[PDB]
């Protein structure tokens, strides 16, 4: 029997928060940098 309901992790982040906006911008730049370097390789 696997029908038991259970709790789940995670919470919705505050997309409007300045910290979230800054963190997203910085991480996105790193990912874009990673992608274009692989393209050259």
């Amino acid at each position: 029997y696997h029908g038991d309901s259970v709790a789940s992790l995670g919470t919705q982040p505050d997309l409007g928060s300045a910290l979230y906006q800054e963190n997203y911008k910085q991480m996105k730049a790193l990912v874009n940098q990673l992608h274009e370097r692989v393209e050259h390789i």
């Binding site: 029997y1 696997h2 029908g3 309901s5 259970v6 709790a7």
Partner: protein
């Protein structure tokens, strides 16, 4: 003109309706769709489908340029506009003609001439059709206003030209009281609105919305198709339509249609038209307007005549003559149509958007027609009309048709959003509606009975709900057993058996606000003995599947019944021809997340709409019930009110901003 390919410049049920007839005739079908309609039933139904841009109809289905461009690119010879959107647009019908595309509808001249009330009345009066009506007057002389009040008779209502909410409004029962009531109304209007202009509108009575289906051709020959009663309306929205109209004699209707037919010949109207009449309690009728399109309620006419009006529209737009003579047309039986709206009748018939999580439907027979443009899992859209489906029935007698519709409505099941179905069940069972005593004020007059509160459930219903829960657990056990190597172990049974004693289970179910304690005993024979309070019930049943719907067959204390069972989230839905009952399964606290978050922010926008007014500064002390903002959505005013007595920390929107649904409007200081 050979119409081998048609573009349908519409969506939803009417697009599917047109495509069904086009395909029956061997005509190729072209759909158009917005980004929001990419997966709609009419897109999948067409032979070709083209994107016309984003979800807002002004940028998609109302974009004449895009529709003409798709008609050219698909090489469609004809455009069927359906109903609404571009169907009554004169510029679009002229543009189709300029581009050599057949508009399947009336000529641009007939659309124009009927689109202006004063023009349409003047043409109708000249054609013999009666022009009488009650209307407001823009002249403001006391003598002129008094002469007009006399013309429309007494009693009359004086109202202010500006403003709402009953301010500056006066009933005048006789000519002697007119002057005093006019001066009273003017003083109140001047005080409230700085305007003393008064209006004088008061038709003696407007009891019946009786309308005639008329059909014309390019040749100019014109025919009528009896009449339809659309008197049962809420805020001028038609709710139940019935053809033929009850209590109108065949002779009277024949005369009624003939006067309308002469007007139809006068404008040489081509394609289907509807002459709307106001009918009094003496069956005198007067022309109201002419809708220059196929009506929504055309299926009740089709069911009583055996005609396909869309098929006739395609043939006549191709240039063929009317298929049957007036002598050939015959009437058999009576028919009814109810419109399924995504509305909450208990909340003043507010439109509701959301998913169709369950959309079971009555089985369709020639008498029962489901005009559905939506399928289970479809989401109703804020951009488009809220109608879910239209149900029409034909019967030998009108009373039998009413019985069939009510049985059918019970079989229709809609879960995921509020609907008007229970309101339609109350309305179709109202004694005055059964008698055929209908008029345009029927819903306002009977509002008290047509809307009613929930009543406590019977103990038998609770027993059935508990049985359904137990059987669902048994089904889950069988599902687990399917994947196990030990397929036949006695442990996989759902007997709930014990050694030398009987297992009694304490279950709790919530009916409304009441918690019901049920003691269920698992019997050796497979039945269940349920005790609720001081009463004991012997319950036995099983689950069987018809189509995609699970059915519960149960017997309580020897009484056998069948019902449709759906268990979604923590609610048990039981659908039976007697009625529908919802039972709530209590949610354990530990799983309740045990995380209450007070009330951050203020009321979320009821929907996506422009902010029209802001009543709160960046730092303002407010008390519960203090209006914070006013928002207009699809032309419906909502005023946001203060949830708490806390001072306002900040405001997220300013006036003129468009706020998306459920977005925070105000920030309140933490206390």
């Amino acid at each position: 003109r050979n119409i081998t390919k048609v573009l349908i410049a519409n969506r939803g049920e009417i697009a599917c309706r047109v495509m069904r007839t086009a395909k029956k005739l061997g005509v190729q079908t072209v759909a158009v769709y917005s980004e929001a309609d990419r997966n709609s039933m009419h897109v999948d139904m067409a032979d070709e489908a083209y994107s016309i841009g984003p979800a807002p109809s002004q940028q998609s289905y109302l974009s004449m340029e895009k529709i003409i461009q798709v008609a050219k690119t698909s090489a469609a010879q004809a455009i069927h506009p359906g109903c609404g959107f571009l169907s009554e647009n004169m510029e679009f019908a002229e543009l189709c003609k300029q581009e050599g595309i057949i508009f399947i509808g009336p000529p641009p001249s007939a659309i124009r001439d009927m689109g202006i009330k004063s023009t349409s009345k003047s043409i109708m009066a000249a054609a013999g059709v009666p022009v009488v009506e009650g209307y407001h007057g823009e002249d403001q002389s006391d003598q002129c206003l008094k002469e007009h009040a006399r013309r429309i008779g007494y009693p009359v209502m004086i109202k202010a030209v500006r403003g709402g909410g009953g301010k500056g409004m006066r009933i005048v029962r006789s000519e002697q009281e007119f002057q005093e009531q006019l001066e009273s109304a003017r003083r109140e209007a001047k005080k409230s609105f700085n305007d003393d202009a008064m209006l004088i509108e008061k038709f003696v009575d407007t009891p019946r919305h009786v309308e005639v289906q008329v059909f014309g051709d390019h040749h100019g020959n014109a025919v009528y198709l009896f009449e339809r009663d659309c008197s049962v309306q809420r805020r001028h929205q038609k709710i139940i339509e019935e053809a033929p109209a009850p209590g109108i004699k065949s002779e009277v209707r024949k005369k009624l249609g003939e006067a309308a037919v002469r007007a139809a010949k006068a404008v040489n109207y081509v394609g289907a038209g509807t002459v709307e009449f106001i009918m009094d309690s003496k069956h005198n009728f007067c022309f109201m307007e002419m809708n220059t399109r196929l009506q929504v309620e055309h299926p009740v006419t089709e069911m009583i005549t055996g005609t396909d009006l869309v098929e006739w529209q395609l043939r006549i737009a191709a240039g063929e003559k009317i298929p049957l003579s007036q002598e050939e047309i015959t009437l058999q039986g009576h028919a009814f149509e109810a419109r399924i709206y995504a509305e909450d009748p208990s909340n003043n018939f507010m439109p509701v958007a959301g998913p169709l999580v369950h959309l079971s439907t009555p089985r369709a027979d020639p008498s029962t027609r489901i005009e559905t443009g939506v399928r289970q899992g479809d989401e109703v859209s804020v951009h488009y009309d809220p109608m879910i489906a239209k149900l029409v029935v034909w019967a030998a007698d009108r009373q039998a048709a009413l019985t069939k519709l009510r049985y059918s409505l019970r079989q229709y099941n809609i879960v995921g959003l509020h609907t008007n179905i229970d309101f339609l069940l109350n309305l179709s069972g109202h004694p005055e509606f059964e008698a055929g005593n209908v008029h345009t004020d029927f819903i306002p007059q009977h509002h008290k009975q047509l809307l009613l509160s929930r009543k406590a459930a019977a103990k038998e219903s609770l027993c059935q709900a508990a049985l359904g829960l137990i059987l669902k657990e048994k089904a889950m056990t069988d599902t687990f057993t399917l994947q196990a190597h030990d397929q036949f172990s006695p442990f996989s049974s759902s007997s709930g058996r014990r050694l030398n004693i009987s297992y009694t289970r304490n279950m709790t179910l919530k009916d409304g606000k009441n918690n019901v304690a049920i003691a269920v005993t698992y019997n050796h024979d497979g039945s269940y003995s349920m005790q609720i309070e001081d009463k004991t019930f012997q319950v036995l049943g099983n689950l069987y599947s018809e189509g995609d719907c699970t059915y519960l067959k149960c017997s309580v204390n020897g009484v056998a019944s069948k019902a449709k069972l759906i268990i979604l989230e923590n609610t048990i839905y039981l659908f039976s021809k007697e009625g529908s009952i919802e039972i709530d399964i209590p949610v354990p606290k530990y799983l309740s997340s045990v995380s209450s978050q007070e009330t951050q922010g203020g009321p979320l926008a009821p929907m996506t709409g422009t902010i029209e007014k802001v009543f709160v500064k960046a730092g303002d002390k407010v008390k519960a019930g203090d209006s914070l903002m006013v928002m207009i959505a699809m032309k419906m005013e909502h005023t946001i009110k203060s949830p708490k007595d806390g001072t306002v920390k900040k405001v997220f929107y300013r006036e003129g901003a468009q706020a998306n649904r459920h977005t925070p409007l105000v920030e309140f200081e933490e206390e």
